[PDB]
């Protein structure tokens, strides 16, 4: 129902931003872009519970203790040891948001003026990458191609 | 719904600030910038509970104790020791805010006047970095390019 | 919602103060500054509980005691010792404030008059640092650059 | 909300005081100052509980006692000793105030008349330090610079 | 809120007193002073509980006693001794006042007439110190400087 409208709005934002940043370099209307946004709407909760290790005796936190030591001499021995500890704790209750951007894909066409060089193409690709909100974490994809218009 | 409007407002703030600081150096309208803000809306709580180590006998905090020591002479021995401790404690209840900036990305175009030199470009990049609120913690990204306008 | 307005007010205060202190040295309007304030709105509590160490017998605080000592002569021995202590205590309930400044970033442009020397630039940087409320604890950043206006 | 107004009032007080003390020496309006006050609004309580040491037998406060001593002659011995003490105590309930000054930073410009000498500059710095309410505990910072006005 | 007004009143009192005592010596209006009062508003209670030592047998206060002594002759012996004491006690409930002066700082300028000598300066400093309510306990600070007026 409304999910399509929300996705369309996000795509329109990113498209107008890319065109508005790249227009002053190449011209008024010699560039077009279309973006496809993979939105996620799955309601999601979470509850971590982290404990810091207290195995090493250097920073254990003893609340109690009992250390009995017998020794006879045929060197019989004995060593009992009860220990009650205290432990750190961290608890988060993260309730994710419905409507985030999980992945993007952008295709941009640039006009001749007649080929545009390689350095200018690379810097234009870089401007677009930075204007998208690019992130190699989400697996985003970009491809800018140069071909004469008609 | 409103998340897009809030993000648009934040982006507009940062954009107008960058342009207003960089305009007096390069000219009235010979620079443009577009920023993409990755906002986070996930409701999040937290509860730490930290304990200071009292393993070392130099600063333990004994509440009780009982130290029995027998010894016969065939040097039989014995050593019992019960200890009850007291421990420090820290407890925080951090309820994060919904609407913070998790990551930024800024693309800026500067005009010729005809190339601008390298030192001026570097100081302009540095001004922009400082005016953004840049932070290598959040993974922010900046790229300023110089190309003739049309 | 209102967080942007509060941040804008804080930034306006710091900006007007920096410009008002630096204007009489360099001129009426030959300087501009823009500041970006990283505000924190996360509601936060805390509860410390500190205990002073009473391990050393020089300043323990005994409430009770029982020290039995037997000895026979084959020098058999015995030594029992029960001890009940009293301990210091400190308890704070710190409820942090929502709306503090976690980090600042300031960019300032100064006009030619034609380069300004190095000593004057250093003292101007120092005036700005002192007028900000600078603090190397919060990780604040400052950068003042000199470039001709237009 | 109102925290900014309170901070502005405190800063105005300190600024007018510094200017009013330093004006009669250097002139009517040949000095300006701007101060940045780091105020603290975190609600804070506290509860100490101090105990004076009674380990040394020179000033213990015995409420009871029981000292049994047997001895046979093969010099067998015995010594039991129960002791009940009384201890001093101090208890404070300090509820800190919301709105104190945690740190200050002052920047002052003085006019030529043409350089002002070093001794006069040092005594002016000292007057300002004393008029601020300076304190090396809070980490306050002062810097007075001399530069011709325009 | 009102704390600033109370502090201003205290400062005005001390300032008018210092000027009124120092005026008849140096002249009608050839001296100015400005004081900065560090007031404390933290609500504070207290409860001491002091016990006088009764370890020494010279002034113990026995309520009961039981001293058994056996002796056989191989000189076997025995000595049991139970003692119940009575102890002094002092209890204060000090509820501090909100609005006391924790620290002062005074800066005074005196006019030429042309330097004023060292003895007169020292006695003027001493008059000011005595008129303040000076106290090396609170860490108060005074500095009087002589410079020509304009």
Curated annotation (Swiss-Prot), chains A, B, C, D, E:
Family per record: Belongs to the FliF family.
Induction: Inhibited in nutrient-poor medium.
Name this protein carries in UniProt: Flagellar M-ring protein
Polar residues: bias regions: 74-85
Subunit composition and interactions: The basal body constitutes a major portion of the flagellar organelle and consists of four rings (L,P,S, and M) mounted on a central rod. The M ring is integral to the inner membrane of the cell and may be connected to the flagellar rod via the S ring. The S (supramembrane ring) lies just distal to the M ring. The L and P rings lie in the outer membrane and the periplasmic space, respectively.
Subcellular location: Cell inner membrane; Bacterial flagellum basal body
Full protein: residues contained: 232 to 438 of 560
Coiled-coil ranges per UniProt: none
Function: The M ring may be actively involved in energy transduction.
